């Protein structure tokens, strides 16, 4: 029966793994520890904007803005773990893109995922007692924004340093995936080779494939708290961590050539 | 009469306390006066958008949405506030006036 530990959460902290795999993950800036004024404001209830009510100090908004323009004007904000993917409705263009410090705050303040990071980070830890969390400090992660096609994003599962399974992150059908799926399987398997320096033998890494390059996006624990997507967690448990080939799951949906290419394989069944 | 509105003027009403029944028997928190330069979450039909409060009179308030919404005048709206890191329903409204993108 699989369990979550204090250090499994600690290692998944953006700073904790970015440091290790900088060359493997797209450009970001980490403000650690998070400015007290920004944290203070973050904990206040309701979303107050300056455009008797607390708003972060001029020093903080200048520092966030300094990071933004240094990352080419547009960014994607995060705390130690969760991205505000749930709060796209508050955003001005329906994406995690942030050109201003206000846009950043608006996203972080209205996100339930960000809120989980703030008061539910160790809600399943056997090693920790949620009473008030060691040499730990919250961080504001600012990742350089880019047009990311949600089709070529994959969630990859790892048990005892072996690639167990991987699946599509989106929930739409893409016909062009089954065409390159063998090449992605190579790309993602070859990236895990470079994730050997990671401290946990069981983890879940998010990846983004663009121009024959499998980009690391995040790392989350091998625990049901982290969404198993197209795979069930009982399915992921009931899986060989010593089997040479991993299970792939894509979203489900002609020529004489196609038809009889299929025959050739249907003939190959009768044989072996 | 459906259009794409950027800012809306609403006729509202708030709840006195938040929804729910605390097990200790203690009353739910009293819903406070909607203050200006507060970003609420408005449910305008299927659309869930953020709206900044620019002014308040009494049973009337003008809201500057975060991105444009598709509605008609007299549509029923649901006002929500970030309380204890939850989107909690505070009240309801009707669009009486609204400024379009075109």
Curated annotation (Swiss-Prot), chain A:
Keywords: ATP-binding, Chaperone, Cytoplasm, Magnesium, Metal-binding, Nucleotide-binding. Coiled coil: none annotated. GO terms for molecular function: ATP binding; magnesium ion binding; protein folding chaperone. GO terms for cellular component: cytoplasm; cytosol. GO terms for biological process: eukaryotic translation initiation factor 2 complex assembly. Disruption phenotype: Inviable. This is Translation initiation factor eIF2 assembly protein. It comes from Schizosaccharomyces pombe (strain 972 / ATCC 24843).
Curated annotation (Swiss-Prot), chain B:
Changing residue 82 to A: Disrupts binding to CDC123. Residues 93-102 are annotated as: Interacts with CDC123. It is found in: Cytoplasm, Cytosol. It comes from the Eukaryota. Disruption phenotype: Inviable. Eukaryotic translation initiation factor 2 eIF2 is a heterotrimeric complex composed of an alpha, a beta and a gamma subunit. The factors eIF-1, eIF-1A, eIF-2, eIF-3, TIF5/eIF-5 and methionyl-tRNAi form a multifactor complex (MFC) that may bind to the 40S ribosome. Interacts (via C-terminus) with CDC123; the interaction is direct. Interacts with GCD1. Interacts with the eIF2B complex subunits GCD6 and GCD7. Interacts with methionyl-initiator methionine tRNA. Present with 20800 molecules/cell in log phase SD medium. As a subunit of eukaryotic initiation factor 2 eIF2, involved in the early steps of protein synthesis. In the presence of GTP, eIF-2 forms a ternary complex with initiator tRNA Met-tRNAi and then recruits the 40S ribosomal complex and initiation factors eIF-1, eIF-1A and eIF-3 to form the 43S pre-initiation complex (43S PIC), a step that determines the rate of protein translation. The 43S PIC binds to mRNA and scans downstream to the initiation codon, where it forms a 48S initiation complex by codon-anticodon base pairing. Belongs to the TRAFAC class translation factor GTPase superfamily. Classic translation factor GTPase family. EIF2G subfamily. This is Eukaryotic translation initiation factor 2 subunit gamma. The lineage of its organism: Eukaryota, Fungi, Dikarya, Ascomycota, Saccharomycotina.
